[PDB]
C-alpha cells in the first residue's frame, strides 16, 4: 500500500480517529501505528460484516466505501505514523 496515496484518503477518517490517528472520542479507537496488517484485515472485516452490532455499524458503512487498493493504502499510511 502507498502511504501517500492514504494519506489522501483519510480525510474522512480524521472527524473520528484524529488527524494523527489518536482518537479523542471515549469509546473510539487510536489508528496511529497499529499493525498494517491488522489494519487491513480489520477494514476488510467491517466491509464484510464480520464485526457487527454497536459501533460497528458506523465502521461498516465507512468500509463498503472503500475498495481494496484504498484499506491497503489506509493501513500503510496509519501504521505509518
Ligand atoms: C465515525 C463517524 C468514524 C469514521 C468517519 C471512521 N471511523 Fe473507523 N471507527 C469508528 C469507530 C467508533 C470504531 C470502533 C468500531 C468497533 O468495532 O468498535 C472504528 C473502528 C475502526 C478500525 C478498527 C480499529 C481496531 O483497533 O480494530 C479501523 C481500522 C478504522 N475504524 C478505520 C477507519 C478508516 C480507515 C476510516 C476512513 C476511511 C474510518 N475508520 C472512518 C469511527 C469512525
Known sequence: GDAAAGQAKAA???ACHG??????????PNLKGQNEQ???SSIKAY???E????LAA????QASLL?????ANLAA?????
Do not use: E, F, H
Open 58 to 61: 458506523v465502521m461498516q458503512a
Open 19 to 28: 488527524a494523527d490517528g489518536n482518537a479523542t472520542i471515549p469509546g473510539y
Open 77 to 81: 499510511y496509519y501504521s505509518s505514523l
Open 12 to 14: 474522512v477518517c480524521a
Open 67 to 71: 475498495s481494496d487498493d484504498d484499506i
Open 47 to 49: 466491509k464484510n460484516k
Open 38 to 40: 491488522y489494519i487491513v
Open 51 to 54: 464485526r457487527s452490532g454497536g
